Structure 1
Amino acid sequence: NAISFALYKAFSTNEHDRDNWNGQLKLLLEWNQLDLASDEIFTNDRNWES
């Protein structure tokens, strides 16, 4: 819960993964971060198609 929370921050602040939100999901799926993915990826202000 500390490594993946740190690795996600350096990924999210690259300013090129707004379109590449799919990279942040497979990162949070390689680890086990439910609460982080439910709050910062699946929160409906971003545009995904499901």
Structure 2
Amino acid sequence: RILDHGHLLTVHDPEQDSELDTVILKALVKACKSQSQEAQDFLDELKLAVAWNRVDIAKSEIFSGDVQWSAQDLEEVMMEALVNDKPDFVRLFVDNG
């Protein structure tokens, strides 16, 4: 049954991955994607992505066509990226509405 779920399980190989924040973010994003498609549920994953400077993961998964993002949904994370000096995420948020 555990494997039958699958989407809630991830493998961290320090030989291959060696970056725990990337794997953690990927696992949380996968769980959220399998859970729901609303943008309000991706806000904490987005905050973690901003804090870890994982712009590529956010672009690939969080800001894909599956999830619809509004301008008002991104105001708080825009402020977080601005105050914390994350220009890549500022550019991404401008690009996404």
How does the TM-score come out when normalised to structure 1? 0.69
| Higher RCO by CA contacts (8 Å cutoff, separation 6 or greater) | 1
Partners of 1:48 and 1:6 lie apart in 2 by 24
Higher Cα Rg, which structure: 2
How does the TM-score come out when normalised to structure 2? 0.42
Partners of 1:32 and 1:22 lie apart in 2 by 15
Instruction: Give the helix-richer structure, 1 or 2.
Output: 2
Q: Is residue 31 from structure 1 mapped to residue 52 from structure 2 by the alignment?
A: yes
5+ long unaligned stretches in structure 2: 1-17, 72-97
Query: What is the root-mean-square deviation of aligned Cα atoms in Å?
Result: 2.2
5+ long unaligned stretches in structure 1: none
Matched-pair identity in %: 28
